[PDB]
Symmetry: D2
Subunit: 273 residues, 4 copies
Amino acid sequence: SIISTKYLLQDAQANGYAVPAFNIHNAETIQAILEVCSEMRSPVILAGTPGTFKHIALEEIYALCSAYSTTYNMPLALHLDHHESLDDIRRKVHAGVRSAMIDGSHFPFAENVKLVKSVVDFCHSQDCSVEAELGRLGSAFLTDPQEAKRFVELTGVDSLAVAIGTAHGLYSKTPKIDFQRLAEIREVVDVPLVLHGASDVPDEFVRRTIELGVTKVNVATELKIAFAGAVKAWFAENPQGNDPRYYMRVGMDAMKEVVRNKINVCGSANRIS
Amino acid sequence: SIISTKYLLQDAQANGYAVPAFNIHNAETIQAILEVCSEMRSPVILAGTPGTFKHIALEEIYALCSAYSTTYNMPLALHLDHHESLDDIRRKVHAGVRSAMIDGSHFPFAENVKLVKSVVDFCHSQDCSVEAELGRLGSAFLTDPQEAKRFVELTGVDSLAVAIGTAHGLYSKTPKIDFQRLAEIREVVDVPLVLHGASDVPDEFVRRTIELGVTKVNVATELKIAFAGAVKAWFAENPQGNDPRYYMRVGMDAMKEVVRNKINVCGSANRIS
Amino acid sequence: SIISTKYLLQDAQANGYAVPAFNIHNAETIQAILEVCSEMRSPVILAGTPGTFKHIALEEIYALCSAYSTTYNMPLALHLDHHESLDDIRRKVHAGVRSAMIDGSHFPFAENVKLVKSVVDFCHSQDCSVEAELGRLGGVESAFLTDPQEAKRFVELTGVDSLAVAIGTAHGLYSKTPKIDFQRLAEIREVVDVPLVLHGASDVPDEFVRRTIELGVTKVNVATELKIAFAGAVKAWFAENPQGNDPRYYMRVGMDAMKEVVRNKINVCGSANRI
Amino acid sequence: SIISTKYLLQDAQANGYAVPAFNIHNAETIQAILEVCSEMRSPVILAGTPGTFKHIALEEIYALCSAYSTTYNMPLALHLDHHESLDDIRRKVHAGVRSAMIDGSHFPFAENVKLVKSVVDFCHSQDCSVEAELGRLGGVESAFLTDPQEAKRFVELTGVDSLAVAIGTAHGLYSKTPKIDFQRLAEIREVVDVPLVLHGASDVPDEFVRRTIELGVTKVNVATELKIAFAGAVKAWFAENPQGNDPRYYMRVGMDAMKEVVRNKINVCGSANRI
Ligand code: NA
Ligand code: NA
Ligand code: NA
Ligand code: NA
Ligand SMILES: [Zn+2]
Ligand SMILES: [Zn+2]
Ligand SMILES: [Zn+2]
Ligand SMILES: [Zn+2]
């Protein structure tokens, strides 16, 4: 079963935990995530960016998730991360995806709203949930609480990505997270909040953001560093080695450690049954 | 569409070419093969051994092939290579596979026949084609023409793997292929013949075996060496690199060269439409 | 695509129309409904009861609806009407259905709530929307009329996506013009913000159904009128063609009669051109 | 699982039975056939003609058969009966069907061969088996009777998996006991080793069908008797129940009448306990 995240993030919100959202690339990266989530009874979101689908097309990622849903006996929420076009999201929703992020955050408010609204209208007709973003990751760079209230009112989005100090990738210095702004947003925004850029954020800061209303925590970079680091080590030690059953498994196992760490921080263990 | 190889190997036989049978492991290895086969208009067989499916289960390999069949607009023959048990083949055929190899070649003739026959009876009830083997790869080590005639008569197999001097893996010295024995087998066996162990066999020898009746050429080792060699080089040059879109693509591109070389030797270009 | 009705009934509520929910039986009945909904650009819900699925199993109805979704290029909402247990609903949701009605209305409040809650918990984990019922269906006393304050508490405790109300309608035909408790409906709507559902709408006057939609009905269930029209046409064909035997003729005559009902119900629900 | 009939008709040929091939229309007709085939452990072919699929489209029939395959835990062979062009067969094979009949029998030999060959070339690339016809159906001269030597050449030139013969059968009922050209059948079998197919088997005496199987028929097509039995039962129910309307009753009465025909044809074909 492939599902949206409408009920899922509401449950996270109501119970004080967040759903980890992991960016995936292929069979082994999906499987690594699901081996841990199934064991820990954690919900999960499996996400791909447009660049993801230039490597393995969505039709094949979808097919893999549909089969893995049966294999691990769990419905799965496949999610379009940082998509930017209504036409592209339409094609991908027709292909079966039921969660999308439309990211218009580098546009002025009015144009962001128009883009996002066009995506909400289509996606809700397809039973697809919609995330959008107000504020840029990394003024323009912090989400304003009253603006976020209005943004959600004009768009009808199911969840909202906020800008409170996180950034994609590694941080060169420990980030500064604006917990007071987060608290203020949560006071006036009722839809589930989303935290991007969570790789390399101290666990105590992520935990605090979930206490203050974060329902979805996105992790991409740490997964890739772990996977790749292990494959690199394996080829160094095995110059004549060539069987993916061996080298991809060492990548999977290093990635699994990160997945367990993130489930722990998100508080998502034992939230499904 | 997922299909058997019943018509496919008959066409190869009738037109003097062979179908390349490539062992696959995951999305990228399947895709690499199909990018070349679709471009060259070549039929192909995508094969997995039992160990293959311990890495990515058949249900997920099946799902990938079903999606890739649509993506490349071609029915695909997924094939169980060197399977050894009726129960396991039954499960995998129920999961959708429509070509199987039952390898009882390390058993005495009578027990090989009993095993193979049990598999033929089931598989034909499921519209699944069946390959079997008489003679061991590497006396016991060369297929006897009259024994191969009787073997096919008692089993009802759709194709027959023969032992004429090939071996799995690389050869330490140029192999000696028994072309006269092959010719003798072909005189008394009417079902399509299969050549295992084709990695590292000189092209001129494979070409001659197809002139003398080989219809299916199995290649595994050369694919893995190429893929892995390229990934290894990429990590050496990119110690901090981590995106599978980059490193898996360099593996795919090195593998594609091998795939094109094998299509050329097999004479399978422009055999589909 | 097979979908839930969560966004669908919210759009109906916000725009003051209702989605017609037609009980189906087989390919021809689904097809007749979709022919009309396609041409009138109307949303629809396709419903089956436990007894339906003892004739043609849910897996086969699901397969038909999935295929018809592609054929008509429209997501479709298949719905379990008047289902009664968690074990059965779980299998049918696992089989692909994304909208269910758990009918616990025969049981006292607390037992009703506990049953419904078990189904909502499961179904929401599957992205399946859930309808439930408080008060019993049947014309004109307390068992047969939803109490507004109980309705508020019921929806709060269970987490249902929509509520089937009991306001004087009944399954089947009415022996006399029904008395519908419009005031009660209004008072439920006052305290319940989830979409409301009207059962028993066959043979209810159009004026009355329209009024219930003005008062918050978002889903109108119709079964009996469809079967009477289908069967009546088939009856008449056989009388007219005593040697006739080709189902391509007689099932189409039945379809065409049922299509007239479907159009009439789309008209009363105000669902044309809402897609 | 949806499969071709290539191994199926070879088993029938080798064991001296025939597979019954029943024309279907919708869910109830498929279901009636599978109920009986399941209990009698008989293989079956489910067939639809172009006109069938103008009532309920192939994609929906396919979806039903796929689901029924799972429900009955048996691979099923869906078959395109009397299809006429490559463009249509290509779409229906792409839609999932793995057995087709290309009927070029209206055309002169060479045109027949060229058409059939185009379909065999395509279908075999899709793992779809192909039936074709030489000579025209209809009771008792040359157009209506397959020539053995022409049959040999036809099968050689086209590569078909099975051959529909013309030996005196006709679609529909017979106004008098048909004269079947058993000798001709034998002479075709002499020179054609691919499985043979008998069309028009409704209303042919059991003795005669049995004889054709002894002479090489591997597939027996039945349509008309199924519809007469279904419709006759529905006719009688409506007469007995002038207010009746529930399709769960009247479609089951029709099913049950058709099941009696299905049993009778399994009996004549000798296909029980061959699975
Ligand atoms: Na980060
Ligand atoms: Na080798
Ligand atoms: Na009623
Ligand atoms: Na007849
Ligand atoms: Zn992000
Ligand atoms: Zn081998
Ligand atoms: Zn009702
Ligand atoms: Zn016919």
